[PDB]
DNA sequence: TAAATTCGGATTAGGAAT
DNA sequence: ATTCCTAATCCGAATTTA
C-alpha cells in the first residue's frame, strides 16, 4: 500500500532538505513523450496503486504545495521527467500568512497560531459561518481574550473553512483574486470570458498550483531550446500553460481538451493576452476525441513533446459527501481516457 | 434562469494512549 | 492488535436571489 511521504516534499522542494537528484524509471516509462499526471493525494485506498499500475508502475511524487506558497495542496504527480536541476520560477509567491495577507495583522488574534492556509477548494465558507464566529466572539470584546472553549470553536472553524481575519471578529474566506495569486496565476486570469464569480471559485479550486507544476516542468527548458508541442488534457484554466509561460518555454502548439466553455474562454484569453505566437487548438469532450484525431494531429504538427493533465477528482476528494466512490466514478474514471490518449501518443513516438 | 447561497459527514492517516 | 483522539479535504444537492 502506497504510503504518503512525511514531509510531503516529493523528490525535494526549495529551501528544504532531502533533495534527490536521480531516480530509476521502468524502461516502459521512458519517453518520448514526456507526460505529467496530477490528482489529489488523499484518495480512497487503492486509487494511487491503480493509477500507478496504468502509468507504467511509476511511483507518484507526492508534494504539498505549502512549500511553494501560503496554501497547502497535497497532490500526487506521476511523470517521466528528469528530476535533476529543477529550478523555481521567480519571484516565488509569499510563503506565510503574515506576508501573503499584509493587512491581516490588524485583525489577527494572538490565539490563532496559523502561519499557512489549508487547501484551496471549490466550496468556501458561508456568510452565515462568518456571522456565527462574529456572534460567538463579541461577548468578550472588552476582555483581553475569549475563553478557551470559544477559542477552539473559532480555530476549528477557521481551519475547516480556510478563513482569514478581515475585520473586527470577522473571519471570511479567500476572494477569487487571492486564490489566483496563491495558486500562482496572474491577477484577473479568471475574470472575463463569461465566467461568473461562482465559476471562478470552482475553476480555481480545481486548478494547479502553478509554482509547484512549474518547478517540476523546469527541467524541460534545456531539453527543448526551440519550444514544445503540448497535448493538454483536462486543461482547466490553463495551469500547465501558465507554468510553461512562466518558464519561458515556447509553446509551438497546444492541443487543449477541456469540456467547460468558460474555461476554454479563459485559456484563449490567456493565449491572446500573453501574445503567444504558437497555435492553440481547443477540443471540448475528451470522450469524443478519437485515437485517429490524435494521430492526424501528430502527423500534421510532428508529434507531442509533452502530455500534461489532471483528470477529475470529484469521486476521490474527501469533501464529496455523495459520490466519493473512487476511481471508477462517473467523473474520475476519465483518468482512463488520459491513459488511452497517452498510449496513442506513445505508439507514434516510441513504437510497438 | 444564471448566479449566488447554504447546507450537508465520511474516508483516511497518524500519534498517543492502553 | 484495539481505543481514542486530532486533523485535512481539487465536493453535491437543493434552494433561493435577482
Ligand atoms: N469529459 C471531459 N472532457 C474534457 N474535459 C473534462 C471532461 N470532464 C471533466 N473535464 C475537465 O477536467 C478538468 C479537471 S480539473 C484540472 C484543471 C487544470 N489542472 C488547471 O490548471 O486548471 C476540469 O476543468 C473539467 O472541466
Amino acid at each position: 500500500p502506497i504510503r504518503l511521504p512525511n514531509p510531503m516534499i516529493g523528490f525535494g522542494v526549495p529551501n528544504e532538505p532531502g533533495l534527490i537528484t536521480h531516480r530509476s524509471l521502468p524502461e516502459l516509462a521512458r519517453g518520448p513523450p514526456f507526460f505529467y499526471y496530477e490528482n489529489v493525494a488523499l484518495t480512497p485506498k487503492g486509487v494511487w496503486e491503480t493509477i500507478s499500475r496504468h502509468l507504467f508502475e511509476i511511483p507518484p511524487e507526492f508534494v504539498d504545495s505549502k512549500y511553494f506558497c501560503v496554501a497547502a495542496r497535497k497532490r500526487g504527480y506521476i511523470h517521466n521527467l528528469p528530476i535533476n536541476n529543477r529550478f523555481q520560477i521567480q519571484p516565488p509567491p509569499k510563503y506565510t500568512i503574515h506576508d501573503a495577507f499584509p493587512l491581516s495583522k490588524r485583525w489577527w488574534p494572538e490565539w490563532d497560531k496559523r502561519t499557512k492556509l489549508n487547501c484551496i477548494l471549490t466550496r468556501t465558507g458561508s456568510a452565515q459561518l462568518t456571522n456565527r464566529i462574529r456572534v460567538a466572539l463579541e461577548p468578550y470584546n472588552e476582555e483581553p481574550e475569549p475563553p478557551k472553549h470559544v477559542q477552539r470553536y473559532v480555530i476549528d472553524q477557521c481551519k475547516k473553512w480556510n478563513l482569514v481575519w478581515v475585520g473586527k471578529n470577522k473571519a471570511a474566506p479567500l476572494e477569487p483574486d487571492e486564490m489566483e495569486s496563491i495558486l500562482g496565476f496572474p491577477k484577473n486570469h479568471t475574470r472575463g470570458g463569461g465566467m461568473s464569480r461562482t465559476e471562478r471559485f470552482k475553476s480555481l479550486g480545481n486548478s494547479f498550483q502553478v509554482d509547484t507544476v512549474a518547478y517540476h516542468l523546469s527541467v524541460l527548458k534545456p531539453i527543448f531550446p526551440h519550444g514544445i508541442n503540448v497535448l493538454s488534457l483536462f486543461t482547466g484554466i490553463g495551469g500547465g500553460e501558465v507554468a510553461l509561460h512562466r518558464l519561458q518555454i515556447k509553446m509551438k502548439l497546444v492541443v487543449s481538451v477541456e469540456i467547460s466553455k468558460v474555461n476554454r474562454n479563459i485559456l484563449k484569453d490567456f493565449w491572446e493576452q500573453t501574445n503567444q505566437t504558437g497555435e492553440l487548438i481547443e477540443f471540448s469532450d475528451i470522450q469524443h476525441l478519437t485515437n485517429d484525431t490524435i494521430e492526424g494531429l501528430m502527423e500534421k504538427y510532428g508529434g507531442f513533446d509533452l502530455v500534461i493533465g489532471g483528470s477529475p477528482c470529484n469521486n476521490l476528494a474527501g469533501g464529496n459527501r455523495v459520490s466519493r466512490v473512487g476511481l471508477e466514478g462517473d467523473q474520475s474514471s476519465l483518468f482512463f481516457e488520459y491513459c488511452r490518449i497517452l498510449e496513442v501518443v506513445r505508439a507514434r513516438m516510441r513504437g510497438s
Side-chain angles (χ1 to χ4, degrees), chain A residues 38 73-75 118-119 122 313-314 319:
Chain A
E38 177 264 336
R73 208 176 185 77
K74 303 162 171 55
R75 260 77 183 129
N118 281 2
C119 181
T122 71
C313 56
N314 314 48

PDB file of all heavy atoms in Angstrom, chain A residues 38 73-75 118-119 122 313-314 319, chain C residues 5-14:
ATOM      1  N   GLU A  38      -1.576  14.503 -12.730  1.00  0.00           N
ATOM      2  CA  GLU A  38      -1.822  15.099 -11.425  1.00  0.00           C
ATOM      3  C   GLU A  38      -3.181  14.665 -10.887  1.00  0.00           C
ATOM      4  O   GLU A  38      -4.145  14.532 -11.645  1.00  0.00           O
ATOM      5  CB  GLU A  38      -1.761  16.633 -11.507  1.00  0.00           C
ATOM      6  CG  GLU A  38      -2.069  17.350 -10.200  1.00  0.00           C
ATOM      7  CD  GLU A  38      -3.521  17.771 -10.114  1.00  0.00           C
ATOM      8  OE1 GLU A  38      -4.156  17.929 -11.182  1.00  0.00           O
ATOM      9  OE2 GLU A  38      -4.020  17.950  -8.983  1.00  0.00           O
ATOM     10  N   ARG A  73      -1.481  22.120  -0.466  1.00  0.00           N
ATOM     11  CA  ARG A  73      -2.105  21.453  -1.609  1.00  0.00           C
ATOM     12  C   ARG A  73      -1.379  20.121  -1.797  1.00  0.00           C
ATOM     13  O   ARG A  73      -0.334  20.072  -2.453  1.00  0.00           O
ATOM     14  CB  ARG A  73      -2.062  22.306  -2.868  1.00  0.00           C
ATOM     15  CG  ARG A  73      -3.210  22.003  -3.834  1.00  0.00           C
ATOM     16  CD  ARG A  73      -3.210  22.938  -5.042  1.00  0.00           C
ATOM     17  NE  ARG A  73      -4.373  22.729  -5.908  1.00  0.00           N
ATOM     18  CZ  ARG A  73      -5.594  23.178  -5.629  1.00  0.00           C
ATOM     19  NH1 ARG A  73      -5.806  23.861  -4.512  1.00  0.00           N
ATOM     20  NH2 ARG A  73      -6.600  22.956  -6.465  1.00  0.00           N
ATOM     21  N   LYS A  74      -1.936  19.062  -1.210  1.00  0.00           N
ATOM     22  CA  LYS A  74      -1.319  17.739  -1.205  1.00  0.00           C
ATOM     23  C   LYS A  74      -1.726  17.000  -2.477  1.00  0.00           C
ATOM     24  O   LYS A  74      -2.868  16.544  -2.602  1.00  0.00           O
ATOM     25  CB  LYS A  74      -1.733  16.970   0.048  1.00  0.00           C
ATOM     26  CG  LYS A  74      -1.382  17.686   1.348  1.00  0.00           C
ATOM     27  CD  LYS A  74      -2.164  17.136   2.531  1.00  0.00           C
ATOM     28  CE  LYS A  74      -1.654  17.708   3.843  1.00  0.00           C
ATOM     29  NZ  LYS A  74      -1.669  19.210   3.832  1.00  0.00           N
ATOM     30  N   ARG A  75      -0.795  16.879  -3.418  1.00  0.00           N
ATOM     31  CA  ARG A  75      -1.082  16.269  -4.706  1.00  0.00           C
ATOM     32  C   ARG A  75      -0.063  15.190  -5.031  1.00  0.00           C
ATOM     33  O   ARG A  75       1.063  15.187  -4.529  1.00  0.00           O
ATOM     34  CB  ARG A  75      -1.095  17.310  -5.830  1.00  0.00           C
ATOM     35  CG  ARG A  75      -2.488  17.740  -6.217  1.00  0.00           C
ATOM     36  CD  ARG A  75      -2.988  18.688  -5.198  1.00  0.00           C
ATOM     37  NE  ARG A  75      -4.361  19.139  -5.396  1.00  0.00           N
ATOM     38  CZ  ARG A  75      -5.284  19.105  -4.442  1.00  0.00           C
ATOM     39  NH1 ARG A  75      -4.981  18.621  -3.246  1.00  0.00           N
ATOM     40  NH2 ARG A  75      -6.501  19.564  -4.673  1.00  0.00           N
ATOM     41  N   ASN A 118      -4.821  26.212   4.554  1.00  0.00           N
ATOM     42  CA  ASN A 118      -5.074  24.864   4.090  1.00  0.00           C
ATOM     43  C   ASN A 118      -5.476  24.917   2.618  1.00  0.00           C
ATOM     44  O   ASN A 118      -5.330  25.945   1.948  1.00  0.00           O
ATOM     45  CB  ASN A 118      -6.112  24.188   4.991  1.00  0.00           C
ATOM     46  CG  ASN A 118      -5.506  23.697   6.295  1.00  0.00           C
ATOM     47  OD1 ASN A 118      -4.318  23.901   6.549  1.00  0.00           O
ATOM     48  ND2 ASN A 118      -6.316  23.057   7.130  1.00  0.00           N
ATOM     49  N   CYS A 119      -5.974  23.804   2.101  1.00  0.00           N
ATOM     50  CA  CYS A 119      -6.074  23.643   0.663  1.00  0.00           C
ATOM     51  C   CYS A 119      -7.186  24.539   0.121  1.00  0.00           C
ATOM     52  O   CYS A 119      -8.235  24.699   0.751  1.00  0.00           O
ATOM     53  CB  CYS A 119      -6.328  22.164   0.354  1.00  0.00           C
ATOM     54  SG  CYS A 119      -6.459  21.714  -1.395  1.00  0.00           S
ATOM     55  N   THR A 122     -13.196  24.074  -4.001  1.00  0.00           N
ATOM     56  CA  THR A 122     -14.261  24.644  -4.823  1.00  0.00           C
ATOM     57  C   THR A 122     -15.426  25.181  -4.001  1.00  0.00           C
ATOM     58  O   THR A 122     -16.280  25.885  -4.552  1.00  0.00           O
ATOM     59  CB  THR A 122     -14.802  23.612  -5.825  1.00  0.00           C
ATOM     60  OG1 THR A 122     -15.562  22.613  -5.134  1.00  0.00           O
ATOM     61  CG2 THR A 122     -13.667  22.950  -6.582  1.00  0.00           C
ATOM     62  N   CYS A 313     -11.166  14.930  -9.968  1.00  0.00           N
ATOM     63  CA  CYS A 313     -11.029  14.360  -8.634  1.00  0.00           C
ATOM     64  C   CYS A 313     -12.338  14.328  -7.865  1.00  0.00           C
ATOM     65  O   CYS A 313     -12.316  14.038  -6.666  1.00  0.00           O
ATOM     66  CB  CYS A 313      -9.988  15.129  -7.815  1.00  0.00           C
ATOM     67  SG  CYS A 313     -10.303  16.903  -7.664  1.00  0.00           S
ATOM     68  N   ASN A 314     -13.464  14.634  -8.519  1.00  0.00           N
ATOM     69  CA  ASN A 314     -14.766  14.640  -7.853  1.00  0.00           C
ATOM     70  C   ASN A 314     -14.952  13.405  -6.984  1.00  0.00           C
ATOM     71  O   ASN A 314     -15.273  13.507  -5.795  1.00  0.00           O
ATOM     72  CB  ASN A 314     -15.892  14.711  -8.891  1.00  0.00           C
ATOM     73  CG  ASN A 314     -15.643  15.750  -9.960  1.00  0.00           C
ATOM     74  OD1 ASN A 314     -14.560  15.812 -10.542  1.00  0.00           O
ATOM     75  ND2 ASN A 314     -16.650  16.571 -10.234  1.00  0.00           N
ATOM     76  N   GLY A 319     -13.989  15.949   0.362  1.00  0.00           N
ATOM     77  CA  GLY A 319     -15.102  16.868   0.522  1.00  0.00           C
ATOM     78  C   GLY A 319     -16.399  16.378  -0.086  1.00  0.00           C
ATOM     79  O   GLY A 319     -17.461  16.922   0.233  1.00  0.00           O
TER      80      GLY A 319
ATOM     81  P    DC C   5     -12.040  10.050  23.166  1.00  0.00           P
ATOM     82  OP1  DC C   5     -11.810  10.960  24.308  1.00  0.00           O
ATOM     83  OP2  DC C   5     -13.347   9.373  23.015  1.00  0.00           O
ATOM     84  O5'  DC C   5     -11.746  10.830  21.804  1.00  0.00           O
ATOM     85  C5'  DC C   5     -11.306  12.172  21.843  1.00  0.00           C
ATOM     86  C4'  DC C   5      -9.862  12.293  21.387  1.00  0.00           C
ATOM     87  O4'  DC C   5      -9.384  11.028  20.880  1.00  0.00           O
ATOM     88  C3'  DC C   5      -9.645  13.255  20.245  1.00  0.00           C
ATOM     89  O3'  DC C   5      -9.556  14.571  20.752  1.00  0.00           O
ATOM     90  C2'  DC C   5      -8.313  12.777  19.666  1.00  0.00           C
ATOM     91  C1'  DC C   5      -8.334  11.269  19.955  1.00  0.00           C
ATOM     92  N1   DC C   5      -8.549  10.412  18.742  1.00  0.00           N
ATOM     93  C2   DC C   5      -7.516  10.251  17.808  1.00  0.00           C
ATOM     94  O2   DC C   5      -6.437  10.834  17.991  1.00  0.00           O
ATOM     95  N3   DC C   5      -7.729   9.461  16.722  1.00  0.00           N
ATOM     96  C4   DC C   5      -8.906   8.851  16.558  1.00  0.00           C
ATOM     97  N4   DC C   5      -9.070   8.084  15.473  1.00  0.00           N
ATOM     98  C5   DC C   5      -9.966   9.002  17.499  1.00  0.00           C
ATOM     99  C6   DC C   5      -9.746   9.784  18.562  1.00  0.00           C
ATOM    100  P    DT C   6     -10.139  15.802  19.903  1.00  0.00           P
ATOM    101  OP1  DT C   6     -10.399  16.917  20.840  1.00  0.00           O
ATOM    102  OP2  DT C   6     -11.240  15.290  19.055  1.00  0.00           O
ATOM    103  O5'  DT C   6      -8.924  16.188  18.940  1.00  0.00           O
ATOM    104  C5'  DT C   6      -7.604  16.267  19.465  1.00  0.00           C
ATOM    105  C4'  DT C   6      -6.586  16.373  18.347  1.00  0.00           C
ATOM    106  O4'  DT C   6      -6.535  15.126  17.611  1.00  0.00           O
ATOM    107  C3'  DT C   6      -6.868  17.465  17.323  1.00  0.00           C
ATOM    108  O3'  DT C   6      -5.668  18.141  17.010  1.00  0.00           O
ATOM    109  C2'  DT C   6      -7.432  16.701  16.121  1.00  0.00           C
ATOM    110  C1'  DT C   6      -6.716  15.363  16.233  1.00  0.00           C
ATOM    111  N1   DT C   6      -7.492  14.218  15.685  1.00  0.00           N
ATOM    112  C2   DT C   6      -6.953  13.457  14.670  1.00  0.00           C
ATOM    113  O2   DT C   6      -5.863  13.680  14.171  1.00  0.00           O
ATOM    114  N3   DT C   6      -7.747  12.416  14.253  1.00  0.00           N
ATOM    115  C4   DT C   6      -8.998  12.066  14.743  1.00  0.00           C
ATOM    116  O4   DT C   6      -9.637  11.112  14.304  1.00  0.00           O
ATOM    117  C5   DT C   6      -9.498  12.904  15.812  1.00  0.00           C
ATOM    118  C7   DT C   6     -10.838  12.628  16.425  1.00  0.00           C
ATOM    119  C6   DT C   6      -8.729  13.925  16.225  1.00  0.00           C
ATOM    120  P    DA C   7      -5.720  19.547  16.241  1.00  0.00           P
ATOM    121  OP1  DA C   7      -4.433  20.238  16.490  1.00  0.00           O
ATOM    122  OP2  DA C   7      -7.002  20.213  16.573  1.00  0.00           O
ATOM    123  O5'  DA C   7      -5.790  19.116  14.704  1.00  0.00           O
ATOM    124  C5'  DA C   7      -4.761  18.305  14.157  1.00  0.00           C
ATOM    125  C4'  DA C   7      -5.104  17.879  12.741  1.00  0.00           C
ATOM    126  O4'  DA C   7      -5.847  16.654  12.772  1.00  0.00           O
ATOM    127  C3'  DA C   7      -5.979  18.856  11.965  1.00  0.00           C
ATOM    128  O3'  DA C   7      -5.146  19.709  11.182  1.00  0.00           O
ATOM    129  C2'  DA C   7      -6.876  17.946  11.091  1.00  0.00           C
ATOM    130  C1'  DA C   7      -6.528  16.522  11.557  1.00  0.00           C
ATOM    131  N9   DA C   7      -7.680  15.645  11.774  1.00  0.00           N
ATOM    132  C8   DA C   7      -8.664  15.788  12.714  1.00  0.00           C
ATOM    133  N7   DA C   7      -9.567  14.833  12.687  1.00  0.00           N
ATOM    134  C5   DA C   7      -9.137  13.997  11.664  1.00  0.00           C
ATOM    135  C6   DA C   7      -9.657  12.792  11.126  1.00  0.00           C
ATOM    136  N6   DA C   7     -10.771  12.202  11.572  1.00  0.00           N
ATOM    137  N1   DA C   7      -8.978  12.216  10.108  1.00  0.00           N
ATOM    138  C2   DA C   7      -7.860  12.805   9.660  1.00  0.00           C
ATOM    139  N3   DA C   7      -7.275  13.929  10.083  1.00  0.00           N
ATOM    140  C4   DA C   7      -7.971  14.482  11.096  1.00  0.00           C
ATOM    141  P    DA C   8      -5.762  20.808  10.184  1.00  0.00           P
ATOM    142  OP1  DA C   8      -4.736  21.860  10.029  1.00  0.00           O
ATOM    143  OP2  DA C   8      -7.137  21.154  10.612  1.00  0.00           O
ATOM    144  O5'  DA C   8      -5.854  20.034   8.793  1.00  0.00           O
ATOM    145  C5'  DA C   8      -4.686  19.448   8.245  1.00  0.00           C
ATOM    146  C4'  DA C   8      -5.019  18.644   7.009  1.00  0.00           C
ATOM    147  O4'  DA C   8      -5.904  17.555   7.363  1.00  0.00           O
ATOM    148  C3'  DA C   8      -5.722  19.429   5.904  1.00  0.00           C
ATOM    149  O3'  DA C   8      -5.149  19.094   4.658  1.00  0.00           O
ATOM    150  C2'  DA C   8      -7.174  18.968   6.007  1.00  0.00           C
ATOM    151  C1'  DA C   8      -7.011  17.539   6.496  1.00  0.00           C
ATOM    152  N9   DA C   8      -8.153  17.039   7.246  1.00  0.00           N
ATOM    153  C8   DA C   8      -8.820  17.678   8.254  1.00  0.00           C
ATOM    154  N7   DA C   8      -9.807  16.982   8.760  1.00  0.00           N
ATOM    155  C5   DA C   8      -9.784  15.798   8.033  1.00  0.00           C
ATOM    156  C6   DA C   8     -10.580  14.633   8.084  1.00  0.00           C
ATOM    157  N6   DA C   8     -11.597  14.473   8.938  1.00  0.00           N
ATOM    158  N1   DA C   8     -10.288  13.634   7.218  1.00  0.00           N
ATOM    159  C2   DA C   8      -9.268  13.795   6.366  1.00  0.00           C
ATOM    160  N3   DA C   8      -8.451  14.842   6.227  1.00  0.00           N
ATOM    161  C4   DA C   8      -8.768  15.819   7.099  1.00  0.00           C
ATOM    162  P    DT C   9      -5.436  19.998   3.363  1.00  0.00           P
ATOM    163  OP1  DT C   9      -4.242  19.920   2.494  1.00  0.00           O
ATOM    164  OP2  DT C   9      -5.939  21.319   3.799  1.00  0.00           O
ATOM    165  O5'  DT C   9      -6.659  19.254   2.667  1.00  0.00           O
ATOM    166  C5'  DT C   9      -6.556  17.877   2.341  1.00  0.00           C
ATOM    167  C4'  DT C   9      -7.838  17.392   1.698  1.00  0.00           C
ATOM    168  O4'  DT C   9      -8.757  16.951   2.728  1.00  0.00           O
ATOM    169  C3'  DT C   9      -8.599  18.453   0.890  1.00  0.00           C
ATOM    170  O3'  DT C   9      -9.131  17.864  -0.295  1.00  0.00           O
ATOM    171  C2'  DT C   9      -9.719  18.858   1.850  1.00  0.00           C
ATOM    172  C1'  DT C   9     -10.018  17.511   2.469  1.00  0.00           C
ATOM    173  N1   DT C   9     -10.794  17.549   3.741  1.00  0.00           N
ATOM    174  C2   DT C   9     -11.462  16.416   4.117  1.00  0.00           C
ATOM    175  O2   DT C   9     -11.449  15.400   3.456  1.00  0.00           O
ATOM    176  N3   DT C   9     -12.149  16.511   5.296  1.00  0.00           N
ATOM    177  C4   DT C   9     -12.234  17.611   6.125  1.00  0.00           C
ATOM    178  O4   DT C   9     -12.878  17.595   7.169  1.00  0.00           O
ATOM    179  C5   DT C   9     -11.507  18.781   5.677  1.00  0.00           C
ATOM    180  C7   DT C   9     -11.520  20.036   6.501  1.00  0.00           C
ATOM    181  C6   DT C   9     -10.826  18.695   4.515  1.00  0.00           C
ATOM    182  P    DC C  10      -8.183  17.596  -1.566  1.00  0.00           P
ATOM    183  O5'  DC C  10      -8.647  18.660  -2.652  1.00  0.00           O
ATOM    184  C5'  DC C  10      -9.942  18.601  -3.195  1.00  0.00           C
ATOM    185  C4'  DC C  10      -9.980  19.576  -4.337  1.00  0.00           C
ATOM    186  O4'  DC C  10      -8.880  19.122  -5.424  1.00  0.00           O
ATOM    187  C3'  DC C  10     -11.098  19.570  -4.995  1.00  0.00           C
ATOM    188  O3'  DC C  10     -12.024  20.613  -4.478  1.00  0.00           O
ATOM    189  C2'  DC C  10     -10.703  19.946  -6.455  1.00  0.00           C
ATOM    190  C1'  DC C  10      -9.170  19.841  -6.465  1.00  0.00           C
ATOM    191  N1   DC C  10      -8.637  19.183  -7.627  1.00  0.00           N
ATOM    192  C2   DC C  10      -7.200  19.393  -7.954  1.00  0.00           C
ATOM    193  O2   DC C  10      -6.514  20.109  -7.254  1.00  0.00           O
ATOM    194  N3   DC C  10      -6.587  18.737  -9.137  1.00  0.00           N
ATOM    195  C4   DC C  10      -7.383  17.910  -9.967  1.00  0.00           C
ATOM    196  N4   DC C  10      -6.860  17.312 -11.005  1.00  0.00           N
ATOM    197  C5   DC C  10      -8.830  17.667  -9.612  1.00  0.00           C
ATOM    198  C6   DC C  10      -9.449  18.356  -8.421  1.00  0.00           C
ATOM    199  P    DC C  11     -13.384  20.192  -3.735  1.00  0.00           P
ATOM    200  OP1  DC C  11     -14.089  21.441  -3.352  1.00  0.00           O
ATOM    201  OP2  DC C  11     -13.046  19.184  -2.704  1.00  0.00           O
ATOM    202  O5'  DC C  11     -14.246  19.463  -4.869  1.00  0.00           O
ATOM    203  C5'  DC C  11     -14.319  18.042  -4.902  1.00  0.00           C
ATOM    204  C4'  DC C  11     -15.746  17.561  -4.712  1.00  0.00           C
ATOM    205  O4'  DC C  11     -16.121  17.676  -3.314  1.00  0.00           O
ATOM    206  C3'  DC C  11     -16.807  18.325  -5.503  1.00  0.00           C
ATOM    207  O3'  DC C  11     -17.769  17.409  -5.995  1.00  0.00           O
ATOM    208  C2'  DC C  11     -17.412  19.252  -4.453  1.00  0.00           C
ATOM    209  C1'  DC C  11     -17.333  18.387  -3.207  1.00  0.00           C
ATOM    210  N1   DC C  11     -17.321  19.181  -1.932  1.00  0.00           N
ATOM    211  C2   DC C  11     -18.508  19.359  -1.214  1.00  0.00           C
ATOM    212  O2   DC C  11     -19.551  18.842  -1.632  1.00  0.00           O
ATOM    213  N3   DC C  11     -18.480  20.087  -0.068  1.00  0.00           N
ATOM    214  C4   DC C  11     -17.335  20.622   0.359  1.00  0.00           C
ATOM    215  N4   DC C  11     -17.364  21.329   1.491  1.00  0.00           N
ATOM    216  C5   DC C  11     -16.113  20.463  -0.362  1.00  0.00           C
ATOM    217  C6   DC C  11     -16.152  19.741  -1.491  1.00  0.00           C
ATOM    218  P    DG C  12     -18.824  17.832  -7.132  1.00  0.00           P
ATOM    219  OP1  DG C  12     -18.569  16.971  -8.307  1.00  0.00           O
ATOM    220  OP2  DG C  12     -18.841  19.304  -7.274  1.00  0.00           O
ATOM    221  O5'  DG C  12     -20.221  17.366  -6.523  1.00  0.00           O
ATOM    222  C5'  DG C  12     -20.326  16.088  -5.912  1.00  0.00           C
ATOM    223  C4'  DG C  12     -21.745  15.826  -5.437  1.00  0.00           C
ATOM    224  O4'  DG C  12     -22.019  16.597  -4.236  1.00  0.00           O
ATOM    225  C3'  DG C  12     -22.836  16.192  -6.429  1.00  0.00           C
ATOM    226  O3'  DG C  12     -23.906  15.275  -6.317  1.00  0.00           O
ATOM    227  C2'  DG C  12     -23.244  17.602  -5.998  1.00  0.00           C
ATOM    228  C1'  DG C  12     -23.009  17.579  -4.488  1.00  0.00           C
ATOM    229  N9   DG C  12     -22.519  18.849  -3.964  1.00  0.00           N
ATOM    230  C8   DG C  12     -21.492  19.608  -4.473  1.00  0.00           C
ATOM    231  N7   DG C  12     -21.257  20.688  -3.791  1.00  0.00           N
ATOM    232  C5   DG C  12     -22.182  20.646  -2.756  1.00  0.00           C
ATOM    233  C6   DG C  12     -22.398  21.556  -1.695  1.00  0.00           C
ATOM    234  O6   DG C  12     -21.798  22.614  -1.461  1.00  0.00           O
ATOM    235  N1   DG C  12     -23.434  21.140  -0.859  1.00  0.00           N
ATOM    236  C2   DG C  12     -24.168  19.989  -1.030  1.00  0.00           C
ATOM    237  N2   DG C  12     -25.126  19.755  -0.120  1.00  0.00           N
ATOM    238  N3   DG C  12     -23.971  19.123  -2.022  1.00  0.00           N
ATOM    239  C4   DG C  12     -22.966  19.518  -2.844  1.00  0.00           C
ATOM    240  P    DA C  13     -25.241  15.460  -7.188  1.00  0.00           P
ATOM    241  OP1  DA C  13     -25.727  14.104  -7.516  1.00  0.00           O
ATOM    242  OP2  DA C  13     -25.005  16.440  -8.272  1.00  0.00           O
ATOM    243  O5'  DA C  13     -26.250  16.135  -6.163  1.00  0.00           O
ATOM    244  C5'  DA C  13     -26.331  15.642  -4.848  1.00  0.00           C
ATOM    245  C4'  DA C  13     -27.424  16.349  -4.078  1.00  0.00           C
ATOM    246  O4'  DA C  13     -26.910  17.575  -3.510  1.00  0.00           O
ATOM    247  C3'  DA C  13     -28.648  16.738  -4.899  1.00  0.00           C
ATOM    248  O3'  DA C  13     -29.816  16.526  -4.113  1.00  0.00           O
ATOM    249  C2'  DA C  13     -28.410  18.224  -5.202  1.00  0.00           C
ATOM    250  C1'  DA C  13     -27.680  18.678  -3.945  1.00  0.00           C
ATOM    251  N9   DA C  13     -26.761  19.797  -4.145  1.00  0.00           N
ATOM    252  C8   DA C  13     -25.852  19.952  -5.154  1.00  0.00           C
ATOM    253  N7   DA C  13     -25.132  21.045  -5.055  1.00  0.00           N
ATOM    254  C5   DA C  13     -25.590  21.639  -3.892  1.00  0.00           C
ATOM    255  C6   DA C  13     -25.230  22.827  -3.232  1.00  0.00           C
ATOM    256  N6   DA C  13     -24.282  23.656  -3.679  1.00  0.00           N
ATOM    257  N1   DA C  13     -25.885  23.132  -2.090  1.00  0.00           N
ATOM    258  C2   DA C  13     -26.833  22.297  -1.649  1.00  0.00           C
ATOM    259  N3   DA C  13     -27.256  21.152  -2.183  1.00  0.00           N
ATOM    260  C4   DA C  13     -26.587  20.879  -3.314  1.00  0.00           C
ATOM    261  P    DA C  14     -31.281  16.728  -4.737  1.00  0.00           P
ATOM    262  OP1  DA C  14     -32.127  15.626  -4.229  1.00  0.00           O
ATOM    263  OP2  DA C  14     -31.152  16.949  -6.197  1.00  0.00           O
ATOM    264  O5'  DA C  14     -31.771  18.093  -4.074  1.00  0.00           O
ATOM    265  C5'  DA C  14     -31.542  18.326  -2.694  1.00  0.00           C
ATOM    266  C4'  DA C  14     -31.860  19.761  -2.351  1.00  0.00           C
ATOM    267  O4'  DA C  14     -30.721  20.591  -2.651  1.00  0.00           O
ATOM    268  C3'  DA C  14     -33.041  20.340  -3.132  1.00  0.00           C
ATOM    269  O3'  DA C  14     -34.080  20.680  -2.230  1.00  0.00           O
ATOM    270  C2'  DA C  14     -32.470  21.566  -3.870  1.00  0.00           C
ATOM    271  C1'  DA C  14     -31.156  21.831  -3.148  1.00  0.00           C
ATOM    272  N9   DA C  14     -30.100  22.356  -4.012  1.00  0.00           N
ATOM    273  C8   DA C  14     -29.687  21.851  -5.213  1.00  0.00           C
ATOM    274  N7   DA C  14     -28.697  22.521  -5.757  1.00  0.00           N
ATOM    275  C5   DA C  14     -28.435  23.530  -4.842  1.00  0.00           C
ATOM    276  C6   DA C  14     -27.496  24.587  -4.826  1.00  0.00           C
ATOM    277  N6   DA C  14     -26.604  24.804  -5.802  1.00  0.00           N
ATOM    278  N1   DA C  14     -27.508  25.414  -3.760  1.00  0.00           N
ATOM    279  C2   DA C  14     -28.398  25.198  -2.785  1.00  0.00           C
ATOM    280  N3   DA C  14     -29.326  24.246  -2.690  1.00  0.00           N
ATOM    281  C4   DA C  14     -29.290  23.438  -3.760  1.00  0.00           C
TER     282       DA C  14
END
